[PDB]
Design an enzyme around this catalytic site. Structure first.
Site, mmCIF file in Angstrom:
data_model
loop_
_atom_site.group_PDB
_atom_site.id
_atom_site.type_symbol
_atom_site.label_atom_id
_atom_site.label_comp_id
_atom_site.label_asym_id
_atom_site.label_seq_id
_atom_site.Cartn_x
_atom_site.Cartn_y
_atom_site.Cartn_z
ATOM 1 N N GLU A 35 10.827 2.756 0.056
ATOM 2 C CA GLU A 35 10.268 2.308 1.334
ATOM 3 C C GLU A 35 9.001 3.055 1.694
ATOM 4 O O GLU A 35 8.055 2.452 2.171
ATOM 5 C CB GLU A 35 11.303 2.414 2.450
ATOM 6 C CG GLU A 35 12.411 1.383 2.370
ATOM 7 C CD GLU A 35 12.022 -0.046 2.644
ATOM 8 O OE1 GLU A 35 10.870 -0.236 3.178
ATOM 9 O OE2 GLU A 35 12.767 -0.944 2.293
ATOM 10 N N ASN A 46 2.957 -6.068 9.284
ATOM 11 C CA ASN A 46 3.518 -7.358 8.852
ATOM 12 C C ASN A 46 2.770 -8.535 9.465
ATOM 13 O O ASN A 46 2.202 -8.434 10.505
ATOM 14 C CB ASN A 46 4.994 -7.407 9.222
ATOM 15 C CG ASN A 46 5.736 -6.320 8.530
ATOM 16 O OD1 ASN A 46 5.717 -6.217 7.308
ATOM 17 N ND2 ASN A 46 6.336 -5.477 9.324
ATOM 18 N N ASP A 48 3.976 -11.010 11.142
ATOM 19 C CA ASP A 48 4.494 -11.443 12.475
ATOM 20 C C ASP A 48 4.001 -10.529 13.614
ATOM 21 O O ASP A 48 4.525 -10.650 14.751
ATOM 22 C CB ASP A 48 6.025 -11.574 12.465
ATOM 23 C CG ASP A 48 6.789 -10.249 12.365
ATOM 24 O OD1 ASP A 48 6.121 -9.141 12.331
ATOM 25 O OD2 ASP A 48 8.064 -10.334 12.538
ATOM 26 N N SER A 50 4.482 -7.281 13.750
ATOM 27 C CA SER A 50 5.328 -6.067 13.767
ATOM 28 C C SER A 50 4.756 -5.060 12.786
ATOM 29 O O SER A 50 3.965 -5.379 11.891
ATOM 30 C CB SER A 50 6.760 -6.356 13.436
ATOM 31 O OG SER A 50 6.934 -6.835 12.106
ATOM 32 N N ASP A 52 6.298 -1.552 10.400
ATOM 33 C CA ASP A 52 7.388 -0.726 9.897
ATOM 34 C C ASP A 52 6.975 0.726 9.992
ATOM 35 O O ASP A 52 5.878 1.064 9.545
ATOM 36 C CB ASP A 52 7.714 -1.110 8.461
ATOM 37 C CG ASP A 52 8.071 -2.572 8.309
ATOM 38 O OD1 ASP A 52 8.697 -3.110 9.167
ATOM 39 O OD2 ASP A 52 7.710 -3.075 7.281
ATOM 40 N N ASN A 59 11.513 -1.439 11.592
ATOM 41 C CA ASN A 59 10.650 -2.500 12.087
ATOM 42 C C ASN A 59 10.632 -2.619 13.615
ATOM 43 O O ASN A 59 11.659 -2.606 14.271
ATOM 44 C CB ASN A 59 11.122 -3.837 11.505
ATOM 45 C CG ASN A 59 10.215 -4.988 11.831
ATOM 46 O OD1 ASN A 59 10.484 -5.733 12.754
ATOM 47 N ND2 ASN A 59 9.150 -5.055 11.103
ATOM 48 N N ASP A 101 24.910 -3.316 12.293
ATOM 49 C CA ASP A 101 24.557 -4.668 12.804
ATOM 50 C C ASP A 101 25.320 -5.763 12.068
ATOM 51 O O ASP A 101 25.374 -6.863 12.630
ATOM 52 C CB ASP A 101 23.086 -5.018 12.521
ATOM 53 C CG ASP A 101 22.517 -6.023 13.494
ATOM 54 O OD1 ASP A 101 22.850 -5.882 14.709
ATOM 55 O OD2 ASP A 101 21.750 -6.964 13.036
#
Ligand SMILES: [Cl-]
Ligand code: NA
Length: 129
Positions: A35, A46, A48, A50, A52, A59, A101
């Site tokens: 990562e 990203n 969209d 966003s 990270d 995110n 989650d």
């Protein structure tokens, strides 16, 4: 900060990640390698809107608030800036929420592609834990 492999393994173990929700420690070390290359200051933008953040590339659409991501849900209830500390605590605490989650470690693209299906125990070989 850039962690060493076994330095990060030890820090993650101290923070309760070994076998957390079924994922042995090597999964977490492998995820961080691919990562962020063990770098607490890594960031990636990203498509969209966003970003990270940090050693586990958490995110901003779902997990932390950076003030610049439309649709932000801030489920870790933390500013994303806290995830760029040299101390991994905030990142680990949020990662525990992400893995709880219900989609496990699949949240981490690099883990799913580069760690899952390999002998991840090898990532903690030679470490004093
Ligand atoms: Cl922020
Ligand atoms: Na957000």
């Amino acid at each position: 900060k850039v962690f060493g492999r076994c330095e990060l393994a030890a820090a993650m173990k101290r923070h309760g990640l070994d076998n957390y929700r079924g994922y042995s420690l090597g999964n977490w070390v492998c995820a961080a390698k691919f990562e962020s290359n063990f770098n607490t200051q890594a960031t990636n933008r990203n498509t969209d809107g966003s970003t990270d953040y940090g050693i586990l590339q958490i995110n901003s659409r779902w997990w932390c608030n950076d003030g610049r991501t439309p649709g932000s849900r801030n489920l870790c209830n933390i500013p994303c800036s806290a995830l760029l500390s040299s101390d991994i605590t905030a990142s680990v605490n949020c990662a525990k929420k992400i893995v709880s989650d219900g989609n496990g470690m699949n949240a981490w693209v690099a883990w799913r592609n580069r760690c899952k299906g390999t002998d991840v125990q090898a990532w903690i070989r030679g470490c004093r834990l």
